[PDB]
Design a protein around this ligand. Structure first.
Ligand SMILES: NC(=O)c1ccc[n+]([C@@H]2O[C@H](COP(=O)([O-])OP(=O)(O)OC[C@H]3O[C@@H](n4cnc5c(N)ncnc54)[C@H](O)[C@@H]3O)[C@@H](O)[C@H]2O)c1
Ligand SMILES: NC(=O)c1ccc[n+]([C@@H]2O[C@H](COP(=O)([O-])OP(=O)(O)OC[C@H]3O[C@@H](n4cnc5c(N)ncnc54)[C@H](O)[C@@H]3O)[C@@H](O)[C@H]2O)c1
Ligand SMILES: O=c1ccn([C@@H]2O[C@H](COP(=O)(O)OP(=O)(O)O[C@H]3O[C@H](CO)[C@@H](O)[C@H](O)[C@H]3O)[C@@H](O)[C@H]2O)c(=O)[nH]1
Ligand SMILES: O=c1ccn([C@@H]2O[C@H](COP(=O)(O)OP(=O)(O)O[C@H]3O[C@H](CO)[C@@H](O)[C@H](O)[C@H]3O)[C@@H](O)[C@H]2O)c(=O)[nH]1
Lengths: 392, 392
């Protein structure tokens, strides 16, 4: 074999996924403009782990396994490029990881908020038109976001909710409440895709994924040049990965506000597993499937405690600090998000364990010398965002 | 006064509104790039009524009343232009009519779907950033769309719905189900604005307006050069206006599919009244108000019957025809949309009457010679939309 186009395949989730699908014998190609690497240069950021170029990454995989991952370098917002890549590869499935995924980045200034929505929304529209025009039966596996739902006072369902209002009943799209221009772009994406499923018969699966943690997967650990990136800076780094790196370098864990913010999380190993499951068990024509893709819920305070305990076993004397929250969000809220669709399809989860934390912490300690502590604290305010293009 | 910036002020709703607000003694400016006029040239379309240039329109209003409506010609997607206009005028309220509003236009091809979403979503984001940076207390009166709600099997509320799910209760944004790339862009707009209200304290009112009908308002009828446009073509024309022109020229009323499609409608005279009410009674800081802006619900078949009866009184022997529906939508559906917020604020509606239809029909008969019958039938398919840029 089945042919899979992995848009955003040079990224954190995409690279691990591309290697896994190739290993699982799918014919794979990567479509990426590598803009994520440019952002690192422009903002003065760097991965904890040194990573190889996309060309060397692909070359190494071929040298080790003999398998060739085709590469198409370009911006999917450029339809000519996307169309040519689609017609050249003829994918049976498209996994779309190719979007600006940082909430902080989307809040830096007007230019970055606009770039985020334009890049994400238009790129996704182009993908939908490419599928419709060149391969209508192609299954779109889209990366959405648990953040699309916000933090309502009721249980969060997997995309849909059956409501009884004024004596009548109907099943409707779950109300969306995004908290950043980035999360908003995903809400727009989801609405756009749902429409094309009904109007054109597109088959798609929206994976509303929670926060990913970890850096190792079976494939990326096979050789140093296959190593994935591990972000710890305040722009692209996420909660758990950030805390592990902070613990390793002796920086107090950065708890934003009260720390009651609760979210779904999952090991990167499950990210690749879930994507493969979505591909192996495709949506039907005209069907817009929605899966909440995470394995466990944790509050920020809970993560801090887990990392502190894990760090103690390594003599890291982990400390915690309360950082004035740069974001506008509920710091104490109800949270009960449903997640059974992937489990019903055979997901064998890697729940957060002492072993994982020990491994991730030792990893951060291993490359502690590469950590730029100046990038640990957040400097992007949700409320103070301006129109002048900022230079970090 | 009070200063009002009318974005899209050269358009159908915007021009009538700009004149009305000026008459009501608000200081008014019009921000428009006049792209709507370019679309007419590019697609071979033309208004039933001959209209004057925006410059001659404004000059005539000044000659008659002595009042000057300031004009800023530019694309609001160009932030430099928008910022300069905002700083020059210093609006207390911004009424945003400046978007690609045609559902058929948004479905012509990929380029037009992408243009629709980019122009609308990015332009609106720019407006939000301009307000935040140059006049945070400025009230945004946004034109949304009743189409954002789709046609669910339950009552449609005014933006929000209180739900009891699994033993818990909460008031959430009403589930959105748009049926075109244009309607989708409005859903995106609404979500984006709602976010800024919470994050930045923006005050806004989303006017989810129904289908507008009519061509006359007190101000536009004061002189021929102030005359508003009246679209009847299948791209920009809407249901009732189209039927009236069809009746006048002897063309069978174009009922798409079964004709059970039910929607909210309102006289253009109420469009201007509602906008003024929204301006005179502003939203509070951080509040995202949502009003369903229409006065009555009608099915397509009901409109056909009303126009036929009205036409008979003018000896137009109106006939009806069933056109294979170019759109993907429910042709028989439940529809009960709530609309009381504007009434509670003092709306004195002009319900559809025999007088209005007689006037509108005679108007169409008056300019029947200008009607290009080749543009009456729809040629844009929701399902057959392609990627090649079309030339109509
Ligand atoms: N990292 C997480 O914790 C997490 C959690 C939930 C969902 N996701 C989602 O998974 C997807 C991938 O996330 P990630 O962490 O791998 O991100 P990433 O930034 O590491 O990877 C994204 C890749 O997309 C590419 N890209 C962006 N815009 C592109 C364009 N216009 N054309 C071609 N390529 C483009 C970038 O160059 C980059 O290689 C995103 O949608 C993201 O929101 C990630
Ligand atoms: N006409 C209706 O029946 C109806 C019904 C409900 C809601 N509305 C809404 O009211 C608004 C106005 O509708 P209308 O019928 O007056 O439309 P219109 O096309 O007559 O007017 C829109 C105006 O906006 C201007 N414009 C578009 N993009 C612009 C940009 N980037 N920069 C500056 N100016 C720009 C166009 O040149 C045009 O003069 C739209 O949001 C529409 O969806 C209209
Ligand atoms: O050092 C930190 C980092 C984060 N947080 C909080 O932890 C929560 C999660 O934040 P973070 O880990 O930054 O993730 P998100 O910004 O939600 O974004 C990630 O997880 C999302 C899932 O919804 C994906 O959609 C995004 O692409 C991905 O970047 C939030 O309440 C943050 O305010 C802290 O308290 N301290
Ligand atoms: O000749 C016609 C024209 C329309 N319809 C149907 O009538 C309904 C209303 O269509 P139309 O009058 O074209 O309006 P919309 O496409 O809904 O759009 C208008 O009304 C919307 C309110 O939701 C605004 O948001 C849009 O900007 C404005 O163009 C639909 O079911 C159409 O399929 C017919 O049966 N015959």
């Amino acid at each position: 074999g089945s042919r899979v186009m992995v848009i955003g395949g040079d990224g954190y989730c995409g690279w691990a996924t591309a290697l896994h699908l190739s290993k699982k014998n799918y014919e794979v190609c990567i479509v990426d403009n590598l803009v994520r690497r440019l952002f690192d240069h422009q903002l003065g950021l760097e991965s904890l782990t040194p990573i190889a170029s996309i060309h060397d990454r692909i070359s190494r995989w071929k040298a080790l396994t003999g398998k060739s991952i085709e590469l198409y370098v370009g911006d999917i917002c450029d339809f000519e490029f996307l169309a040519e890549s689609f017609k050249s590869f003829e994918p049976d499935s498209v996994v779309h990881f190719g979007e600006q995924r940082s909430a902080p980045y989307s809040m830096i200034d007007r230019s970055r908020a606009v770039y985020t929505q334009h890049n994400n929304v238009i790129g996704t529209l182009n993908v939908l038109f490419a599928i419709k025009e060149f391969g209508e039966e192609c299954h779109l596996v889209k990366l959405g976001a648990m953040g699309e739902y916000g933090t309502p006072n009721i249980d969060i369902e997997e995309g849909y909710i059956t409501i009884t209002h004024n004596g009548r009943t109907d099943t409707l799209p779950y109300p969306k409440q995004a908290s950043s221009f980035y999360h908003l772009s995903k809400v727009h994406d989801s609405h756009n895709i749902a429409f094309t499923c009904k109007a054109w018969g597109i088959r798609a699966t929206d994976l509303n994924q929670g926060v990913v943690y970890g850096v190792k997967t079976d494939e990326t650990e096979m050789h140093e040049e296959l190593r994935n990136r591990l972000d710890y800076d305040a722009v692209f780094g996420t909660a758990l990965n950030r805390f592990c790196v902070q613990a390793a370098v002796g920086h107090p864990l950065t708890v934003y506000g009260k720390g009651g913010q609760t979210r779904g999380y999952l090991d990167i190993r499950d990210t690749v597993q879930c994507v493969e499951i979505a591909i192996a068990n495709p949506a039907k024509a005209g069907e817009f499937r929605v899966f909440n893709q995470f394995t466990e819920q944790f509050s920020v305070n809970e993560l801090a405690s887990l990392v502190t305990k894990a760090g103690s076993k390594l003599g890291l004397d982990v400390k915690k600090m309360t950082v004035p929250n740069p974001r506008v969000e509920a710091e104490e809220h109800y949270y009960n998000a449903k997640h059974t669709k992937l489990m019903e399809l055979g997901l064998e989860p890697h729940y957060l364990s002492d072993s994982l934390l020990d491994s991730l912490l030792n990893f951060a300690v291993q490359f502690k010398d590469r950590v730029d502590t100046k990038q640990i604290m957040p400097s992007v305010s949700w409320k103070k965002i301006g129109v002048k293009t900022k230079s970090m």
